[PDB]
Structure 1
Amino acid sequence: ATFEIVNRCSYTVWAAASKGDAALDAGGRQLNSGESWTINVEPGTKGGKIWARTDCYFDDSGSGICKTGDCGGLLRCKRFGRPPTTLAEFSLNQYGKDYIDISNIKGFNVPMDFSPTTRGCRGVRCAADIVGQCPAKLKAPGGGCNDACTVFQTSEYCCTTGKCGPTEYSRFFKRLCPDAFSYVLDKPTTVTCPGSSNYRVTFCPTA
């Protein structure tokens, strides 16, 4: 399948795409403002993620640091990213359908549209100034708005036991982005698409 990753923001991002234990395609790439990067993801992938990283440095070989979303210091992510990271999430060709979501469960850093480029299903977006509003205790020095599980490590915020409810903080993300997951047991805002759809991830969409 095809993912076209478009930086519509006015600042450079370093896009990332991983499943957790391996890169997807090249695993990451600088995107200056306006730059598009199309990747290939295998049918049937489960639990894929696409995110932005901000304020990175990488040297000639590719090792470095980013202030949000860092994946073990690699330009080319083979693992997931340090919060706060807004997340595009997907598992493809499940049993005849792909399923797409955007998640604020690791926080928010960059506004995002995740829309299908082929018919049948609707996209999802979170574009609100979450970082401009972000509750004071959830702010990340380095940039972004952390989730409460990251800042406080409690069973309730982290839904450790498989039981939890919404919180003042989950609800701060759900007031600003009802279509994105705001905590682990949120009512799902997942989208079911035909198997083998293609997609566009747009950062800063409304930019």
Structure 2
Amino acid sequence: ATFEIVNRCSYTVWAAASKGDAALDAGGRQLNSGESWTINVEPGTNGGKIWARTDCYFDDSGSGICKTGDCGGLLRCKRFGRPPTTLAEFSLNQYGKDYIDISNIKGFNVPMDFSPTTRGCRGVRCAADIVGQCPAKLKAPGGGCNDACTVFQTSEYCCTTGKCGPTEYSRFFKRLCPDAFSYVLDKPTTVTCPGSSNYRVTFCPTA
């Protein structure tokens, strides 16, 4: 499957793509404002994620740090990134269909649209100014809006036992972005797409 990753933000982002225990494609790349990077994701990839990283420094070996979404200091991510990270999440070719969503469960850093480029399903978007509106107690200095689990490490925010409800913090993410997961047991906003669909992830879709 191809994912066209487009940075419409006015600032550079460092895109990242991983399934947690491995890179997808090269795993990461710099996208200046307006740039597009098309990656190949193997069919059957389960639990893949794409995200943006902001304010990164990398040396000539591809090692450094990002203020948001750092993946163990690598340009080419092999693992998931440090919250806060808005997540484009996908599982492909799962019994004939693909499944996509956006999630704020690991916080929010950059607004994103995640849509199919092929027929048969809708896209999802979280484009609101979550960083600007972020509750004070969730604000990340280096940028972004942390999820409550990251900040407070309670069973209720982290849904540790598989039993948890919505919270004042989850409801903030949900209010700003109804079509993204706001906590672990949120009413799902996963979209079913035809198996082997192709996609576009756009950062800053409205600006």
TM class, shorter-chain normalised?
over 0.9
**In 2: Cα distance, 1:125 partner to 1:106 partner:** 16
Off by >4 Å, runs of 4+ in structure 1: none
Q: CA deviation at 1:14?
A: 0.1
Q: CA deviation at 1:100?
A: 0.1
Q: CA deviation at 1:52?
A: 0.1
Equivalence for 1:68: 68
Q: CA deviation at 1:193?
A: 0.2
1:170 partner SS: helix
After superposition, the C-alpha distances for 1:61-98 in whole angstroms (9 at most, x for unaligned) are 00000000000000000000000000000000010100
Q: Percent same amino acid among aligned pairs?
A: 100
**In 2: Cα distance, 1:81 partner to 1:154 partner:** 21
After superposition, the C-alpha distances for 1:103-141 in whole angstroms (9 at most, x for unaligned) are 000000000000000010000000001001100010001
Taking only aligned residues, the RMSD between alpha carbons, in angstroms, comes to 0.3
Q: How many residues align?
A: 207
After superposition, the C-alpha distances for 1:132-161 in whole angstroms (9 at most, x for unaligned) are 110001000100000000000000000000
**In 1: Cα distance, 2:76 partner to 2:144 partner:** 22
**In 2: Cα distance, 1:183 partner to 1:59 partner:** 36
Structure 1 segment 101-116 matched on structure 2, within 5 A = 101-116=101-116
**In 2: Cα distance, 1:34 partner to 1:132 partner:** 22
**In 2: Cα distance, 1:120 partner to 1:54 partner:** 33
**In 2: Cα distance, 1:102 partner to 1:6 partner:** 16
After superposition, the C-alpha distances for 1:16-37 in whole angstroms (9 at most, x for unaligned) are 0000000000000000000000
Q: CA deviation at 1:183?
A: 0.1
Q: CA deviation at 1:53?
A: 0.1
Q: CA deviation at 1:41?
A: 0.4
**In 1: Cα distance, 2:9 partner to 2:198 partner:** 22
1:140 partner SS: coil
**In 1: Cα distance, 2:67 partner to 2:164 partner:** 30
Structure 2 gaps, min length 5: none
Structure 1 gaps, min length 5: none
Equivalence for 2:16: 16
**In 2: Cα distance, 1:129 partner to 1:31 partner:** 21
Q: Please, what TM-score do these two structures have when normalized by structure 1?
A: 1.00
**In 1: Cα distance, 2:28 partner to 2:182 partner:** 26
1:175 partner SS: helix
**In 2: Cα distance, 1:39 partner to 1:31 partner:** 13
